[PDB]
Structures are given as structure tokens and as C-alpha cells.
Design a protein around this ligand. Sequence first.
Ligand SMILES: O=C(O)CNC(=O)C(=O)O
Ligand SMILES: [Mg+2]
Ligand code: NI
Ligand SMILES: [Zn+2]
Length: 331
Amino acid sequence: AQNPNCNIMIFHPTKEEFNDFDKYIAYMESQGAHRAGLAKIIPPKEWKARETYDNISEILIATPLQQVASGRAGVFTQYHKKKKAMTVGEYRHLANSKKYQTPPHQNFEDLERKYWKNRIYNSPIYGADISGSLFDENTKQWNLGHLGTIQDLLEKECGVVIEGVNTPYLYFGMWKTTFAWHTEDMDLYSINYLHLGEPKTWYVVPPEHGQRLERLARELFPGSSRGCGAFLRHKVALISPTVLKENGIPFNRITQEAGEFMVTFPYGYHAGFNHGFNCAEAINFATPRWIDYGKMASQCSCGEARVTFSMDAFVRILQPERYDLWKRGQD
Ligand SMILES: O=C(O)CNC(=O)C(=O)O
Ligand SMILES: [Mg+2]
Ligand code: NI
Ligand SMILES: [Zn+2]
């Protein structure tokens, strides 16, 4: 069995290996990368996502979100307070202001310590889930807006033809902006490219051990667990590495830098934070190996999780018994 310890693997494809996306995902899996839940891909030196970023300040963040925490430093939830629209240029200046800028620090480890100690006492502002792409149309390799669609994968594997589309999203972050513990919708893969700026730290639980994280989360957030049997789908709960280690939950951590891809694998729980002003692009995707995870994915039916148009068909085809209840929570 490859990668039995479930370590995060890092890959350095050559330019030739970077041509066929599906092939290279299958290669990483042959080496056991999926067992970690997360992999890093460093693009060949000959590759570029676009020529420059000198022209991005005019993008609009229609609904910036202020991430307000409740709880204790290691175990907290966050809610999103909507803020007035701002451009990327406005947001970058905000990020770099004295109130929001990254503090002085020695190294990534010192910054991680400061994050876990102090995050709850501040409310950073995140530009999330902005439909769009920063890949140049002429970039042919690993262009996140030109991937094979999940609808097409389900059609090829299962023969059924469904509605829905699959497009990328932009994320603009600052110091302390936070992604809560989650798996993807329908336990899909994700791929994330850090276009520019300061790093993103990731934490991940191996897919084979995801239910250990779920059990701890029910213990730590007991009212939330009573409200919903899949409340991690709400994407609001944070648990620190120190708390995970205290409770024996297997996990790994890694820091992504600008110019690097991360792939999350089906049912790989992940969480993290941004080090300072940055811009990432991400999208969900599927492979044949996903289909069994899609069929077994938990679902939120309490109303809170509310998701895209395209998840309807996934539930309807893969999970017909659950469909009527889930759709009630959509409506
Ligand atoms: O970058 C973020 O804020 C969160 N991204 C992801 O959860 C991802 O790519 O799957
Ligand atoms: Mg612009
Ligand atoms: Ni994710
Ligand atoms: Zn719910």
C-alpha cells in the first residue's frame, strides 16, 4: 500500500507531464497521494498562469465578509457579517492597513503560533466565492477554467445526461482570514492555485480517518450537532492543531506559497488561514474514483448549508433516497 502513513506529498511535474491533467491526478494517486487528503503540485519552471497581475485592482468584491469568532482560542465558530462592496484595490489597501496587516514574525511557525493564540480577538474581512478566473486564455496546462466538467464525468461514467455547470471562484484574503473544517460539496475534489501574495496554511485529516474528526466535532460543538447531523457542511467550525493532537486526531499541515497548486481529495477534511493579502482561484472536479464517494457523501438538510444550482442533479442521481429531504432544506 503506497503512503501508508498518509503524509502530504509534493510533486514536481515536468513540462511534458503537465499536459494531461487527468493523467497526472491518476499518477499522484498511484503513489498514494490521496491518502493524505491533500497534495502540493509545483508547476514546471517553464509554466506561467498569466503574464502579470498588474491589472487586477478593478475586480469587484460585491459582498466582502467580516469573519467574527465566538468560543475559545482553540475551539471556535465564525459567522460572516456582510460588508459594503469594494474593489480589489480598496481591499488590498485595507489588508495592508495597521488594523489588518500581518504582524512582525520570525518564520511561518511563529506566525502559526500567533494565529492560534490571537485569531478570535480580531475580525478579518474575506473576499470569497467570487465567480471568475485569472488564468490567461492562452494558458493551456492546468488552467482551472478549462477543466473537464463534473457533469461530463458523471455522464461518461454513468451514462446520464444532467443540467449544470462548473466554473472557478476567486478568493481575496488577508491576515487571519479563515477557512473552516469541511469536505467539498458531494465530497468532490478541489484544486486551488495561489495566484499572488502571501501564503496560505492548510490543515488536513486523511480520508480514512474523517469520521474521527466528525466525532470530535460533535463533542466540541454539541448544540450545533443536535441542530444538524452534518453540521460541518455549514463551514463555521474551527479546531486548532493543539486540540486535534490532545484528542488523538490524525492530521497534517503544509504551507502553500504563490505559484503553487493544492489538490484536496474526496472526503479529505481541511481548514486553514491566510498569512496576509493574497488571491487564490479554486474549482471542484471529479474523476472516476470520486463516484463512490459521491454516493456516500453526507448531506445537510437543516437549511443552513445552502449550495449551488448544480448540486441538485448530483443528489438526484447519486442519492435518490435522500433527494426529497435534502431538497426541502434547499427550499
Ligand atoms: O482558499 C480558501 O479560502 C478555501 N479553499 C478551499 O477550501 C479549497 O480550495 O478547497
Ligand atoms: Mg482590474
Ligand atoms: Ni475546500
Ligand atoms: Zn445543516
